[PDB]
Here is the input.
Amino acid sequence: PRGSHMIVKNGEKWMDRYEIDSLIGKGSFGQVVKAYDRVEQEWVAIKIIKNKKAFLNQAQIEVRLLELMNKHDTEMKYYIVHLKRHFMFRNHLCLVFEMLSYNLYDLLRNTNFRGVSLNLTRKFAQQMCTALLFLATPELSIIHCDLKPENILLCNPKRSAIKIVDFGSSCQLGQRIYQYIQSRFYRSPEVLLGMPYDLAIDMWSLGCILVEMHTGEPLFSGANEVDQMNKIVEVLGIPPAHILDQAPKARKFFEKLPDGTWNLKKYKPPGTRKLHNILGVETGGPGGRRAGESGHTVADYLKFKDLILRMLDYDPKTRIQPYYALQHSFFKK
Ligand SMILES: Cc1nc2ccc(-c3cc(N)nc(N)c3)nc2n1CCOc1cccc(Br)n1
Here is the structure.
């Protein structure tokens, strides 16, 4: 009975149904094992939640949100991982999902972190915006709260079809329970500033993830919250004063002057690290490795950049929503 991780034995069979094959990943929530479902005759990934009350309760919200989504007749709900079923077993909550392939970070690593074609970036972007559109569904209104290349899995290794996983920081509009959510690199300024958030935080993460997908480098690689916020300001400049005026953690990064304006405390100047230059819009793409190449015209790069900057709006209110993002000229065929 010792420790909070399930004692998974390789090859052992549960409820005379699931044959554990191997541990395929760990984390904070617990572990994921590959197992054969002799009853449905298929390979399943079982998320085994730590026998710990905090992770049990959080998992229980994951299950509800997954059972909410996977009952909607939409076809947009095929961008979200399928929850086959869940059960209590050896005092651990087990969520049973479809087996998927590797994540968009493993994909980046496959390319020696040079990033993928703008053409493949677009395919990922359209899929993710449609998932986000699906999550913004009134009867759902789910916020993933932890989008990153790691939580975006491929269905097969050959195809570019993606699904989102890990609804373990996930919540619905009005049911916000953590002040500190998201992965730092993909954490929206409102969350950094400690403000109440909505689904607009997932569109922020998406923007960062998309630029990373094509440059193979995190857009904002902050060591801590002060480094994180500073890196964002480097590119996007000082946030709207109207936002920092309500921002609980405003004074963790900025200072108000007598003038009533904000600036930084004791890096490149605000907004002087142009995304345009990060992307190598006019100098043959990231590291110059897309120079002359098809689908990588200055024009193509401009449309992507414009959509990225609509995703990275400091203002959660004016920041672009999945429906409008799909109607963007980056997607038109
Ligand atoms: C191979 C594979 N198929 C999966 C299907 C679903 C899930 C899955 C995993 C989690 N934490 N939460 C949900 N709701 C679904 N994880 C799968 N994995 C493992 C390789 O990806 C990942 C992704 C995230 C974390 C880890 Br460890 N590993």
The first helix runs from residue 53 to 69.
